[PDB]
Design a protein around this ligand. Structure first.
Ligand SMILES: C=C(NCc1c(COP(=O)(O)O)cnc(C)c1O)C(=O)O
Ligand SMILES: C=C(NCc1c(COP(=O)(O)O)cnc(C)c1O)C(=O)O
Lengths: 475, 468
């Protein structure tokens, strides 16, 4: 039915949480996991992360104890999501926000927290927590140097674990109807894992609690697990630290799984591809840890894994295949890059032009020709498409269909220059280019022209239908 | 309580819809609107857009009539989301996806549907619908040339308006408790506006229905409203077309408001800043139309506006202030760019260096022993290591802490412990640009390599304290 949202909400803070739980049947079938892999889609909150909860939570406590008045300044060290939640809470309830986050974190978090009118100071990535230039040390410095400023310190604020203990874990319990055998949580500040594990062990002691920390962090026990990449920087954001946070109660968790960047990102992309959850990299790390931990489980029992934040915070970072290739990470078993490598192989556009047969030079027009002259030339030459010149780059292509339809639509005058009706989005290529790169370029441009700018002697235009015909010529 | 999600969900398709309605009290107070401006946060769906609904809906219909079997190919022209929704439905229920979208649409939509294993064909932006190179014409061509391919044709499929008439409008009715005075909807395919307006007028005929169309489309009535920028391309994606779709029943809507790109984007940024809803540009267009239409309303009555999709699809496009300045769009009334322009003004780093009095190098391969000796003998705290063909900065605090942390041996080269993220500046640069650059780099170094020092945000705050 409609219980939580059947009414009107006073602000966006009332729309955080209440995230649904989805069964990842397809992903489990892909990785061959017999038990039921449940996913807590915390990334569908208002701010798109679990930390939104704690943000609101801390503010509520700060307002319930009278320690916060309107117009004050709020300071918080964060990896980006807790800053987002506190920025939402401040923009709603009238507080000033200043965030301290390392330069390792994505630019989307910085831009969206700027959209909430929050000042953002970046800290060096390689800095240790003891340094005065760390996000926490710099936040303390800012609190010392600013009037009416406050740090809620999610690393030490009891609201962070207490609310995951109060509402989030209760949500997981009500959705799983009490039957939970394993729960896998990423280890960042440690509040989410501490709270949820404590509540579930209280209401279901048979449930195992597994924590995920990236190779480079020191949050796993024993220290034999951290020796892989001791204190080595990683690309995944949100989990792992060079110190044990005050809220992290490592005694509530049973197992620890170390996950690297490559596995985390490949599993996040597999999540997006097979399940359809627009989720972030830390969730890929958590899901890889869950897949490695619950392999010994059998059918019927449920292993619950949390997906902290959405792909929105890493839109340019790891959804783009170019950046995932720059870091040498396997995209996925079934992906478009691998599909195009398998289908096309070492085929170049020269092979396609030879198999079809160009043996021709497409017509040419000076890009300022009148529509009368270009229509006369097109009717006398019998060709359909034409390419307009440059004057100094290339302008584009034009077909008789657009000519007629724009002339009759009142958008192309007969005395108008041909540049006004040409297609302006194009991609330059060369006969030596492979089919995979031109296929990737077709993802962003409708046409692809060859050998632009010896001499500018283009051979033809290339679209996706040509690639489909080339695939049809094979078996 | 917990009614719709208190249980387990079989797939992501069960997470579409059920979006909450929020009262934009702060935005109304900013723009001086007396009535209650309610916002339907359809961007909070699983796929982050309203079109997800119709996507699922069409697939359900295609499966309810047996017209769809496993392994088939699905083709659909879309501005971006209806492709995302159908890609989700196909990846879940085992269908192949091929999308046709104009090059005008953002790259985030294409990348997100590529992550869903969907083929993406781009079409020219200026092409008309009758052209064979339009997304709809090219989709028809693909249907002709591909085996087992299907187009559900959201422009003509009755599922698109029928489901907004069945569940979405019923949702808004149940949350608003029937009392709705005005409904403001963007005009894209026109299915959502038709469905929602028809259902609400059936269950509340006194409610006025106003449609929002961008300056450039011809969907408004009368045609005197489209004459501003006739058939000229605009930057907002999702709303407006050069033809009336088959599902669009223009007779159900009363008013029409034309909105430009600048107003739409500035209002979307104002939505994000004042309310905290990560929404797209079409939502800004709809909200500007609502602010222009419901101005005559009074306290107590409610004007509901749809927020189609989230900022996720335009992260690089219009959330970035650089692109908003490249297109000459006013950022916002209260924004970080305007705040720094007001606080800093035309101040450059020369003025800060003169007011503070900073009168004022390592080859990046000296051993830690020698650098500690130099640091103790020179009494300075920070040092900057040079280049060989710039490497970064290093302080004694990080030196000591990395020595004790087991990461920096005394015989190790200093490059291993230096800070690698840096930003280059020059004394002529203003304070606003270095403040914007500090959003991405912790330090900022000036300018032969004869730099005088490093400047961070605390220095800018001290400079602001030295003024006023
Ligand atoms: C420490 C912070 N992030 C926690 C986090 C985590 C870890 O969640 P914890 O509540 O810290 O246990 C996992 N994934 C992402 C994307 C995260 O951002 C923060 O936002 O300040
Ligand atoms: C053409 C399309 N426009 C829908 C749309 C709309 C208009 O919603 P309609 O259901 O098309 O009436 C508003 N905002 C955005 C971001 C949209 O994508 C589409 O979704 O395929």
């Amino acid at each position: 039915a409609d219980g939580p949202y059947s009414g009107i909400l006073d602000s966006v803070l009332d729309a955080i949480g209440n995230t649904p739980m989805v069964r990842m049947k397809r992903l489990a079938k892909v990785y061959g996991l017999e038990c039921d892999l449940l996913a807590k889609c915390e990334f569908m909150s208002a701010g798109g992360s679990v930390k939104d909860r704690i943000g609101k939570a801390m503010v509520e406590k700060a307002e319930r104890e009278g320690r916060l008045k309107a117009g004050d300044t709020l300071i918080e060290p964060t990896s980006g999501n807790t800053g987002i939640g506190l920025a939402l809470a401040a923009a709603v309830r009238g507080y000033r926000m200043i965030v301290t986050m390392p330069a390792k974190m994505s630019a989307e978090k910085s831009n969206i927290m700027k959209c909430l009118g929050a000042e953002i100071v970046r800290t060096p990535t390689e800095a240790a927590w003891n340094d005065e230039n760390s996000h926490m040390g710099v936040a303390a410095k800012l609190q010392r140097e600013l009037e009416n400023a406050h740090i809620l310190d999610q690393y030490n604020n009891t609201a962070n674990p207490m609310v995951h203990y109060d509402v989030t874990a209760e949500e997981i319990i009500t959705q799983c109807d009490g039957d939970i055998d394993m729960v896998v949580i990423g280890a960042g500040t440690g509040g989410t894992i501490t709270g949820i594990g404590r509540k579930i062990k209280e209401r279901c002691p048979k449930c195992k609690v597994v924590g995920v920390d990236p190779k480079g962090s020191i949050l796993a026990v024993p220290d034999s697990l951290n020796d892989e990449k001791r204190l080595q920087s990683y690309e995944v954001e949100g989990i792992g630290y060079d110190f044990v946070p005050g809220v992290l109660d490592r005694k509530v968790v049973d197992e620890w799984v170390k996950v690297g960047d490559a596995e985390s990102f490949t599993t996040a992309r597999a999540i997006i591809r097979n399940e359809g959850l627009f989720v972030g990299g830390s969730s890929g790390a958590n899901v890889w840890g869950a897949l490695q931990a619950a392999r010994q489980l059998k059918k019927g029992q449920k292993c619950v894994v949390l997906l902290p934040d959405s792909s929105r915070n890493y839109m340019s970072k790891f959804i783009s295949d170019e950046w995932m290739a720059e870091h040498g990470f396997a995209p996925e078993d079934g992906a478009k890059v691998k599909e195009r490598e398998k289908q096309f192989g070492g085929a170049r556009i020269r092979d396609l032009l030879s198999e079809t047969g160009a043996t021709s030079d497409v017509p040419f027009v000076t890009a300022r020709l009148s529509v009368e002259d270009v229509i006369k030339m097109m009717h006398e030459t019998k060709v359909k498409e034409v390419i307009v010149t440059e004057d100094s780059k290339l302008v584009g292509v034009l077909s008789e269909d657009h000519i007629a339809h724009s002339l009759q639509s009142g958008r192309c005058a007969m005395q108008s220059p041909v540049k006004d009706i040409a297609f302006k989005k194009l991609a330059k290529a060369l006969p030596s280019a492979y089919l995979r790169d031109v296929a990737k370029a077709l993802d962003f441009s409708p046409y692809v022209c060859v050998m632009d700018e010896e001499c500018p002697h283009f051979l033809g235009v290339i679209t996706r239908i040509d690639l489909l015909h080339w695939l049809a010529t094979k078996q």
